[PDB]
Amino acid sequence: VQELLQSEVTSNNYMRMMRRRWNNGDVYAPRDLSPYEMKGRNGGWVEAADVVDELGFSPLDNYRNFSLISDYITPFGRIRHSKETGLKPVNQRKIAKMVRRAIGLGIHPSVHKHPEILKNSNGRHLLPLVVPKG
Amino acid sequence: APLIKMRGYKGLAGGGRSLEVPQPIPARQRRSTAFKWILDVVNKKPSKGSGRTMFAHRVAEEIVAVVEGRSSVWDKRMLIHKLGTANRANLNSPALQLKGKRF
Amino acid sequence: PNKPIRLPPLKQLRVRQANKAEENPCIAVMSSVLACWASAGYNSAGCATVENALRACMDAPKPAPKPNNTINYHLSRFQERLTQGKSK
Amino acid sequence: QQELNIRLRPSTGRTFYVSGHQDFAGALKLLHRTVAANKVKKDVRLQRFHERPALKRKRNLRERWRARFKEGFKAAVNRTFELKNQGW
Amino acid sequence: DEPYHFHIYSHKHNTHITVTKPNRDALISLSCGNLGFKKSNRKHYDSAYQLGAYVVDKMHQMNLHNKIKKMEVVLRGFGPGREAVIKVLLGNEGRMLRSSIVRVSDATRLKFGGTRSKKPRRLG
RNA sequence: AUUCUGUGAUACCUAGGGGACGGGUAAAGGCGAAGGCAAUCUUUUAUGUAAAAACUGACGUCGAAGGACGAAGGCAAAGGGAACAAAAAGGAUUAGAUACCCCAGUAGUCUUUGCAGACAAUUAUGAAUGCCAUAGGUUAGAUUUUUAAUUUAGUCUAUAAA
Numbered sequence: 001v002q003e004l005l006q007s008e009v010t011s012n013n014y015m016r017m018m019r020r021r022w023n024n025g026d027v028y029a030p031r032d033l034s035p036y037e038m039k040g041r042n043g044g045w046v047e048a049a050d051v052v053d054e055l056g057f058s059p060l061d062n063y064r065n066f067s068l069i070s071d072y073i074t075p076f077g078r079i080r081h082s083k084e085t086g087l088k089p090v091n092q093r094k095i096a097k098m099v100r101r102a103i104g105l106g107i108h109p110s111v112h113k114h115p116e117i118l119k120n121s122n123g124r125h126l127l128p129l130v131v132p133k134g
Numbered sequence: 135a136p137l138i139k140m141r142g143y144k145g146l147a148g149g150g151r152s153l154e155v156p157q158p159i160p161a162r163q164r165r166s167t168a169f170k171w172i173l174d175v176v177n178k179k180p181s182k183g184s185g186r187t188m189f190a191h192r193v194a195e196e197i198v199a200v201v202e203g204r205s206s207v208w209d210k211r212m213l214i215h216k217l218g219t220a221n222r223a224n225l226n227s228p229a230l231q232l233k234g235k236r237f
Numbered sequence: 238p239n240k241p242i243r244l245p246p247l248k249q250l251r252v253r254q255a256n257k258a259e260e261n262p263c264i265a266v267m268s269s270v271l272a273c274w275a276s277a278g279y280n281s282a283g284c285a286t287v288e289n290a291l292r293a294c295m296d297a298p299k300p301a302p303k304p305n306n307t308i309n310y311h312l313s314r315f316q317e318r319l320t321q322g323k324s325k
Numbered sequence: 326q327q328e329l330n331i332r333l334r335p336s337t338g339r340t341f342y343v344s345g346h347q348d349f350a351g352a353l354k355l356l357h358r359t360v361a362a363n364k365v366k367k368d369v370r371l372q373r374f375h376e377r378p379a380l381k382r383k384r385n386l387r388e389r390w391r392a393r394f395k396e397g398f399k400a401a402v403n404r405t406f407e408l409k410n411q412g413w
Numbered sequence: 414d415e416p417y418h419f420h421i422y423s424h425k426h427n428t429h430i431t432v433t434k435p436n437r438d439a440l441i442s443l444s445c446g447n448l449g450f451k452k453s454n455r456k457h458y459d460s461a462y463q464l465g466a467y468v469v470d471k472m473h474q475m476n477l478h479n480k481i482k483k484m485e486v487v488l489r490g491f492g493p494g495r496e497a498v499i500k501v502l503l504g505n506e507g508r509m510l511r512s513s514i515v516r517v518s519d520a521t522r523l524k525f526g527g528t529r530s531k532k533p534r535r536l537g
Numbered sequence: 538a539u540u541c542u543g544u545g546a547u548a549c550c551u552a553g554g555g556g557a558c559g560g561g562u563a564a565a566g567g568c569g570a571a572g573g574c575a576a577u578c579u580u581u582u583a584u585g586u587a588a589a590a591a592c593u594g595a596c597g598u599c600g601a602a603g604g605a606c607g608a609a610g611g612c613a614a615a616g617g618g619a620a621c622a623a624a625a626a627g628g629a630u631u632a633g634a635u636a637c638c639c640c641a642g643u644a645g646u647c648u649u650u651g652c653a654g655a656c657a658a659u660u661a662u663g664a665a666u667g668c669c670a671u672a673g674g675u676u677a678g679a680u681u682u683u684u685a686a687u688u689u690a691g692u693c694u695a696u697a698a699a
């Protein structure tokens with residue numbers, strides 16, 4: 001029966017090469033199945049629009065949201081460039097100042113994401129601990 | 135026969151020192167280096183007898199010492215192999231990749 | 238995020254190395270051989286296989302080079318139409 | 326945790342765990358990509374000596390233009406093949 | 414329970430390897446100079462590789478490949494030893510310890526401003 | 538090499554104290570008369586920009602002098618002192634080496650109050666007004682059939698007439 005397991009491996013292998021999610025109503029031509037189209041030359045998962053305008057919220061008024069701060073910093077606590085956020089310069093400055101305020105006020109870490117957010121993310125039982133040592 | 139050769143780049147290791155980097159060598163270069171080591175050990179040995187077989191038999195005896203592992207050429211093979219392992223990182227040294235890219 | 242700029246007038250629009258200057262395919266094999274000698278030793282038996290692979294390199298012929306890439310010819314056709322001009 | 330407290334330090338953010346679909350060799354590759362995207366190595370090189378404000382401002386202008394010129398050059402190279410494909 | 418640590422500090426001129434207990438008490442704190450490498454021979458990639466292999470060997474003698482069930486690898490600095498020692502743990506020497514690794518951390522020290530550094534050197 | 542270390546260093550930690558500095562964001566980006574101004578909260582201050590109306594009704598521009606402001610270094614006084622670092626000094630390199638490099642290191646940089654007024658204080662381009670054809674970016678708004686165009690005020694790139 002082991003000969004059936006390797007088939008599942010070969011199947012999922014090809015499924016990884018089909019770098020496209022078909023949806024209902026999507027029109028396709030014989031060209032949309034060739035490698036040039038499946039390769040996905042686009043090396044960037046660009047954002048559609050400025051979410052700050054689409055969600056219509058003032059960043060500075062939402063500085064107390066720990067999840068919102070961790071969303072606009074890298075795992076190392078560094079504010080994300082406008083390339084990753086896809087925001088206008090005006091909205092980028094409001095979200096950057098919203099992160100600096102939370103970190104400056106001392107309610108959010110500066111070199112990683114909030115501890116309570118790390119408790120939920122994968123690697124919960126593996127988080128670095130502090131042995132009392134005494 | 136060794137498997138690598140040590141090429142040096144002039145003035146790229148520091149204060150006028152060279153950057154030694156190993157590289158592979160084809161068969162003819164491997165056999166040529168090997169047999170020339172054997173002849174180097176042969177010429178330095180003393181004379182034994184007389185006749186037309188002096189040089190021939192003196193070389194053949196060294197060929198046997200090599201197969202038995204008791205020859206001196208085995209040291210020269212391991213000596214050059216050490217330089218290769220001791221410099222395997224120079225293949226990507228900053229000097230070998232920054233010749234004229236620091237205007 | 239802004240879009241790519243329109244290049245200023247250049248003397249010539251071209252890429253330095255049109256064809257990818259691929260690396261000798263065996264310099265990677267030698268590194269593996271040099272890696273075993275550091276961990277398993279020189280006169281060991283484990284490295285007896287990698288050495289055979291290294292000896293197999295030089296006994297094989299060198300692949301022939303690919304035809305030149307005509308990218309630079311087409312870049313020179315669309316320079317004035319793609320940039321702000323051409324410097325004299 | 327309730328019994329032991331988490332060690333909150335800069336290394337806590339630069340941590341990558343080993344799991345089923347990610348082994349030690351896989352966590353190293355992920356650690357290198359994130360350490361590169363965050364330019365940790367560049368900061369260690371820039372923080373080794375002091376650069377007064379004027380020199381830092383002028384160094385950024387030179388590097389920021391080479392980045393726009395390079396980005397605008399890749400757009401012209403690929404725009405040339407969009408036209409060549411059409412047959413122009 | 415916190416794992417053991419395998420700190421690997423490496424800079425331009427030397428590399429330090431420290432194996433600590435869960436409470437971060439050093440068990441094996443060695444450097445390239447402990448193997449006899451003198452003033453300038455400590456910066457070589459090869460010398461950092463032998464230090465890694467030496468530490469791994471000394472761990473076996475202490476019977477740590479059986480005592481250590483969870484271990485963390487902490488990297489500090491971008492010297493030659495950062496890659497050399499990794500190929501020891503990832504190679505044939507760390508065969509016994511490779512299975513007990515659960516984390517891979519980077520502890521390179523950066524300053525957000527901080528004290529002023531040396532003035533730039535004029536080598537020419 | 539001087540130098541640090543068996544009076545236990547480097548490395549790895551725990552617990553306290555101190556001083557400055559300001560990572561990412563960040564851009565051809567912005568602000569001010571210029572000098573200059575980049576972590577954060579509250580408090581506080583004059584200009585400037587867009588669109589509509591309303592209001593005053595030439596109330597404008599330039600401006601010797603006087604006064605004010607004016608980078609870094611410096612003087613004076615009282616603090617601070619981690620780091621950096623003129624001076625002084627040591628170790629190297631060198632034909633010689635004050636030097637470039639290195640081990641260390643005092644003024645000084647920082648705080649408060651005055652003095653001082655010289656700068657590649659630069660756009661090597663005083664301020665202001667009327668006017669002259671386009672194109673491609675970018676910054677802050679406004680209008681719209683908010684897709685994208687149109688438009689006001691900035692800034693930069695490449696050109697026409699000149």
Ligand SMILES: [K+]
Nearest residue numbers: 442443444447
């Ligand atoms: K040591």
Ligand SMILES: [K+]
Nearest residue numbers: 572573658659
């Ligand atoms: K200025």
Ligand SMILES: [K+]
Nearest residue numbers: 621622641642
């Ligand atoms: K000093």
Ligand SMILES: [K+]
Nearest residue numbers: 627628634636
């Ligand atoms: K001297």
Ligand SMILES: [K+]
Nearest residue numbers: 674675692693
């Ligand atoms: K414009």
Ligand SMILES: [Mg+2]
Nearest residue numbers: 184185186187
């Ligand atoms: Mg004869």
Ligand SMILES: [Mg+2]
Nearest residue numbers: 531532622639
């Ligand atoms: Mg100095």
Ligand SMILES: [Mg+2]
Nearest residue numbers: 535536537637
């Ligand atoms: Mg010189």
Ligand SMILES: [Mg+2]
Nearest residue numbers: 544545546550
């Ligand atoms: Mg002590």
Ligand SMILES: [Mg+2]
Nearest residue numbers: 555556557558
């Ligand atoms: Mg402080």
Ligand SMILES: [Mg+2]
Nearest residue numbers: 559560561575
């Ligand atoms: Mg900054």
Ligand SMILES: [Mg+2]
Nearest residue numbers: 568569585691
């Ligand atoms: Mg203004």
Ligand SMILES: [Mg+2]
Nearest residue numbers: 598599600664
């Ligand atoms: Mg006036």
Ligand SMILES: [Mg+2]
Nearest residue numbers: 600601602603
């Ligand atoms: Mg006057």
Ligand SMILES: [Mg+2]
Nearest residue numbers: 608609610611
């Ligand atoms: Mg002053």
Ligand SMILES: [Mg+2]
Nearest residue numbers: 610611645646
């Ligand atoms: Mg002063």
